[PDB]
């Protein structure tokens, strides 16, 4: 696929996967779009989508209780509510906007576990995603291990189904859309590569082997039709570091291609 994207791989010593489709211009850009990467926290809005797809109003307002023992690493929001519980919508908010890991687990559990969520996503057309573990084990990202992986094209396409297509009732679609727009963890990634005044919804991820991902939707200023985008990346070494600038630069290249 795209040639400036290839240069980024050498610059940052990574394997890079990119898929972006401009729904207005009817054009896409891709690079290694069918190669597997660990999705890490980017699964969270897909789990929220599946919840908003399959649960009743009552089920969304139901209080979910959990114990101190249930808390996994990095659970800033859920660790505040052990005694009283949280609703699925509050859990969704925490998972998407703060990347709360226990919130991720509560979503997986609500959907019947990773394998059941996988089956739900199969049924809306995602033939690619392979889900198996809970947080934080799902972040391992061992190369060649299929567990908890997808591709840039599949992540983008499935996000598109929930956010832009008709899988969700319009009211619930807006709830998900606003959680993504109000994400707090992505300022240095896709958001950093988009012009001022454009609206972005996104979900970031980070994990083993230097994995660094961001998926989202970009609405160019002026009511233009949206661009769906997924950027995934990983490195050779188990304890490798990532560089957020990779994601910003990939975004800039995508927009140069799509918008020109
Ligand atoms: Ca179109
Ligand atoms: Ca391609
Ligand atoms: Ca703890
Ligand atoms: Ca499909
Ligand atoms: Ca599975
Ligand atoms: Ca399994
Ligand atoms: Ca409904
Ligand atoms: Ca409703
Ligand atoms: Cl399972």
From TrEMBL:
This is Beta-lactamase. Belongs to the class-A beta-lactamase family. Ca(2+) 1 binds at residues 23, 26. GO terms for biological process: beta-lactam antibiotic catabolic process; response to antibiotic. It catalyses: a beta-lactam + H2O = a substituted beta-amino acid. Ca(2+) 3 binds at residues 57, 171. Ca(2+) 4 binds at residues 115, 118, 131-132. GO terms for molecular function: beta-lactamase activity; metal ion binding. Signal peptide: none annotated. Residues 17-232 form the Beta-lactamase class A catalytic domain. The lineage of its organism: Bacteria, Bacillati, Bacillota, Bacilli, Bacillales. Ca(2+) 6 binds at residue 169. Its EC number is 3.5.2.6. It holds the Pfam family Beta-lactamase2. Keywords: Antibiotic resistance, Calcium, Hydrolase, Metal-binding. SUPFAM superfamilies: beta-lactamase/transpeptidase-like. Ca(2+) 5 binds at residue 125. Ca(2+) 2 binds at residues 30, 33. It comes from Oceanobacillus iheyensis (strain DSM 14371 / CIP 107618 / JCM 11309 / KCTC 3954 / HTE831). It is an enzyme of class 3 (hydrolase).
């Amino acid at each position: 696929g795209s040639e400036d994207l290839k240069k980024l791989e050498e610059e940052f010593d990574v394997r890079l996967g990119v898929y972006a489709i401009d729904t207005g211009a009817d054009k896409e850009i891709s690079y290694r779009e069918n190669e597997r990467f660990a999705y890490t926290s980017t699964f969270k809005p897909l789990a929220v989508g599946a919840v908003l797809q399959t649960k009743s109003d009552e089920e969304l307002e139901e209080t979910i209780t959990y114990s101190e023992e249930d808390l996994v690493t990095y659970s800033p929001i859920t660790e505040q509510h052990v005694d009283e519980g949280m609703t699925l919508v509050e859990i969704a908010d925490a998972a998407i906007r703060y990347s709360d890991n226990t919130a991720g687990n509560l979503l997986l559990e609500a959907m019947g576990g990773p394998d059941e969520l996988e089956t739900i996503l199969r049924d809306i057309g995602d033939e690619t995603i392979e889900m198996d573990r809970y947080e934080t084990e799902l972040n391992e990202a061992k190369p060649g291990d299929i567990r908890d992986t997808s591709t840039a094209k599949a992540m983008a396409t499935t996000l598109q189904q929930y956010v832009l297509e008709d899988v969700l009732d319009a009211d619930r679609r807006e709830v998900l859309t606003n959680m993504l727009i109000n994400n707090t963890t992505g300022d240095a990634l896709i958001r950093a590569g988009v012009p001022d005044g454009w609206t972005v919804g996104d979900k970031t991820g980070a994990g083993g082997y230097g994995t660094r991902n961001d998926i989202g939707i970009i609405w160019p200023e002026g009511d233009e039709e949206p661009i769906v985008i997924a950027i995934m990346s990983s490195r050779d070494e188990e304890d490798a570091d990532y560089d957020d600038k990779l994601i910003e630069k990939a975004t800039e290249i995508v927009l140069q291609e799509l918008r020109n």
